[PDB]
Amino acid sequence: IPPPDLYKDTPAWYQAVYKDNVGLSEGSGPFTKYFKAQMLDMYWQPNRHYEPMENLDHSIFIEQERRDLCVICHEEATPGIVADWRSSGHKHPKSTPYLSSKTAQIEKNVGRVLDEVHCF
Amino acid sequence: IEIPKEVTEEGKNVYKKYCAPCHGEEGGGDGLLSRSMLPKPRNFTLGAYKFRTTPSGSLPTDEDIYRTISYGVPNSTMIPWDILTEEQRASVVPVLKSFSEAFEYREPEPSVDVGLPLRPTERTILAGKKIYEEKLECWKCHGVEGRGDGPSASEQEDDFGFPIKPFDFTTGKFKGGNSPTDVYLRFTTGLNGTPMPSFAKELSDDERWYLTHYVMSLVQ
Amino acid sequence: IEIPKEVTEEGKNVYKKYCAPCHGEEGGGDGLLSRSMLPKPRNFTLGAYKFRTTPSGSLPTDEDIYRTISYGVPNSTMIPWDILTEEQRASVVPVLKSFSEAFEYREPEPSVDVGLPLRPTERTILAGKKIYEEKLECWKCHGVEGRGDGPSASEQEDDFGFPIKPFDFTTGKFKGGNSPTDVYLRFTTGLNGTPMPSFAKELSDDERWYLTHYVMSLVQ
Ligand code: HEC
Numbered sequence A: 001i002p003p004p005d006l007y008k009d010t011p012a013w014y015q016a017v018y019k020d021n022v023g024l025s026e027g028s029g030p031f032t033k034y035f036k037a038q039m040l041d042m043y044w045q046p047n048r049h050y051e052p053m054e055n056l057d058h059s060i061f062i063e064q065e066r067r068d069l070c071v072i073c074h075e076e077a078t079p080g081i082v083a084d085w086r087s088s089g090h091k092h093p094k095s096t097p098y099l100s101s102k103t104a105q106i107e108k109n110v111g112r113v114l115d116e117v118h119c120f
Numbered sequence B, C: 001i002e003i004p005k006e007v008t009e010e011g012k013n014v015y016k017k018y019c020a021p022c023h024g025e026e027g028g029g030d031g032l033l034s035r036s037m038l039p040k041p042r043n044f045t046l047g048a049y050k051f052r053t054t055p056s057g058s059l060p061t062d063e064d065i066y067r068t069i070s071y072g073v074p075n076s077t078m079i080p081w082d083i084l085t086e087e088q089r090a091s092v093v094p095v096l097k098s099f100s101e102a103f104e105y106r107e108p109e110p111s112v113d114v115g116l117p118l119r120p121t122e123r124t125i126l127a128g129k130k131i132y133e134e135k136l137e138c139w140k141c142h143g144v145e146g147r148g149d150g151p152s153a154s155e156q157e158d159d160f161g162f163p164i165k166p167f168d169f170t171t172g173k174f175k176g177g178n179s180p181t182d183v184y185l186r187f188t189t190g191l192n193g194t195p196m197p198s199f200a201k202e203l204s205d206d207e208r209w210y211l212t213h214y215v216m217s218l219v220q
C-alpha cells in the first residue's frame, strides 16, 4: 500500500513549488521566486519550509533510540507538552474498549505493537 | 574509571556537542537556550557546585562532578548522560574545571565520612520533626509539609542573582539523589551557591540522620 | 572505629548480657527464647551471614557484622544496638567470629564495588519488571506484587532446616536496609544460608539497578 501522500494526483510542477523542501530561502507556488517565506512557515507548512534545529543537537538521542531521554528532558524543558501527551490517547491507547479496539486495527495495519505513541 | 587531570581534544568536543548548548561555550551558563530555561544551567566559572562530598565552600572532587554528570539533576533539564561512554563523561570533568580559576589555586577538601545510616523509627522521625520545625525552622523556605511554599520561599535567590524558590520535594525527586545517604550528604555538606547552608556544625551526625528520616517522611 | 581481631573479656560480657538470650551461650542460635521466636536467631556457628558486602559463599567482613549489629534486622526481633557504645558493638564482632571455624581458615573475600546508582526512570522500572517476571521469575517465591505469596513461597527452607517464607517486602522494611544501594547489594552478593542466591553472574551491574528500581516500585 503506497505511503500516505498529501500531493497525490498533482503535477510535478505543483509539487516542485509546494512540497519540495526549500528552506526559508524561497516562497511557494508559481510565484515562489518573487518572495520569501515567513519564519513561522517552518511550522505552518513543514514539508515546504521546515529547517532543522540549530542550538541543541538531537541526533544522539535518535541514533541510539533513547525514547526515554525525550521525556526525561522535555518533562522539565517543556512541561506543558508532556502533560498534554501523558493525558492523550497516544500515551494510553488501550485504556478503554473503544481505544483498545481502534488501536488493534492500527497494529495490524502497521505490523507493529503500539503500547504507546511516543514523541519518537 | 580514572578521571584525567589533563584536558583533551575529545573532552573539548564532547562538551562542545553535548554541554555547550545549555552551559555556554565557555561554561558561563549562558548558552542560547539558557535565556528561557528554568532552573538556569550551572555557571561553572564560579566554582560553586551544589552537590559534593566535600564541606561547604569547598570545590567538588573530580568524582563528585562525574557523579552529577552520570546521574543528572532531577527537577531540571539536566538529564543523565549514561548515553555517553565512561571515558567521554570523564574527559569533560577537566573542561568544567578549567572554567573557574578556583580549581587552579585551591585543592578540594577531603570527602566527608558518611558513616552508617541510622535505623529509621517513630522516635527518629519525631526528633527530626522537632529540628525541622522548631530548632532550625526549615518551614521558613520549604513550608510545613516541604511543599516549597513557606513565607520566605518566593524571595530566595542564587549567588548568581537568580531566583531559587525551593522546589516541592514531597515528590521525592531530590536534585542530588533520593537516597537517605544522598539527603544526609546535603545536610552535611551544604549546597554551594544557594541559601541552603551546611548543617554539619549546627547538628551532630545522629541529628542529621534524625532530620533525614523526617524529610523522607514528607515524601508521598 | 577500629574493630579488634582479638577477643576481650568486655566482648565476652557484652555478648553474654545482650546477645546470648537469643543467639545462645555459644552462638548456636539456640538461646531459650529461640524456641518460640520467628524468624529464628542466627546460628553463628555456620559462618553464613545474610547481609554482606562480599560475594556469595564468602565470610562477612568485620565491618559487615558491625553494620548489622548497629542497624539491626527489620522484620525480626533483631533490634538496633545503637543503645550500646561504639566500642561495645565492636568488641563482640570477634566473639561472633569465634563461633565458626570457617573464620579461622578462610579470609573474607574483597568487598564488591557498588558503583554509581543509576537514575530511576520509567524505562529502568520496566526493564526490571521484565527481569523480575520473565527472565528470572522472581514471582515464584515472592509473588507478582512481592507480597511473598508465590507458589513456591511456603516451601522454602533455611540451610539450617528452618522454614524461610519470603516476608512481604511491599512495606519497604528490607532486612538488610531499605536503601537502593542496600537492595542492589543483596542482588549482587546473595543471602548466604537462604535459597535467595546472588545474581552478580546472571545480570550485569546495570541490569541489577534496573531490577532494584522495579523492586522499589513495588513498595507502597
Ligand atoms: C540543557 C538540557 C543542559 C545540557 C545540554 C547540559 N546541562 Fe548540565 N545542567 C543543566 C541545568 C538546568 C543544571 C542546573 C540544575 C539545577 O537545578 O541545579 C545543570 C547542572 C549541571 C551540573 C551541576 C553540578 C552541581 O551544581 O553540583 C553539572 C556538573 C553539569 N550540569 C554538567 C553537564 C555536562 C558535563 C553536560 C554535557 C554532557 C551538561 N551538563 C549538559 C542543563 C544542561
Ligand code: HEC
Pocket (backbone or CB within 6 Å): B039, B131, B132, B136, B137, B138, B139, B140, B141, B142, B152, B156, B164, B165, B166, B167, B169, B173, B174, B175, B176, B177, B183, B186, B191, B194, B195, B196, B199, B211, B215
Ligand atoms: C532558606 C535560606 C532555606 C532554609 C532556611 C532551608 N532551606 Fe533547604 N533549600 C533551600 C534552597 C534555595 C534549596 C535549593 C533548591 C534548588 O532548586 O536547588 C534547598 C534545598 C534543600 C533540599 C533538596 C536537596 C536535594 O538534593 O535536592 C532539601 C532536602 C532541603 N533543602 C532541606 C532543608 C532542611 C532539612 C532545612 C532545615 C534544617 C532547610 N532545608 C532549610 C532553601 C532553604
Ligand code: HEC
Pocket (backbone or CB within 6 Å): C014, C015, C018, C019, C020, C021, C022, C023, C037, C038, C039, C040, C041, C042, C048, C049, C050, C051, C052, C065, C068, C069, C073, C075, C076, C077, C078, C079, C081, C092, C096, C175
Ligand atoms: C533476640 C531479641 C535477639 C537478641 C537479644 C540479639 N539478636 Fe541478633 N538476631 C536475632 C534474630 C531473630 C536474627 C535473624 C533475623 C533474620 O530475620 O535474619 C538475628 C540476626 C543477627 C545477625 C545476622 C547477620 C546476618 O545474618 O547477616 C547478627 C550479626 C546479630 N544478630 C548480632 C547480634 C548481636 C551482636 C547481639 C548482641 C548485641 C544480638 N544479635 C542480640 C535476635 C536477637
Ligand code: HEC
Pocket (backbone or CB within 6 Å): C039, C131, C132, C136, C137, C138, C139, C140, C141, C142, C152, C156, C164, C165, C166, C167, C169, C173, C174, C175, C176, C177, C183, C186, C191, C194, C195, C196, C199, C211, C215
Ligand atoms: C526462592 C528460591 C526465591 C527466588 C526465586 C527469589 N527469592 Fe528473593 N528471597 C527469598 C528468600 C527465602 C529471602 C529471605 C527472606 C528472609 O526472611 O530472610 C529472599 C530475600 C529477598 C529480598 C529481601 C532483601 C532484604 O534485604 O530484605 C529481596 C528484595 C528479594 N529477595 C528479591 C528477589 C528478586 C529481585 C528475585 C528475582 C531475581 C528473587 N527475590 C527471587 C526467596 C527467593
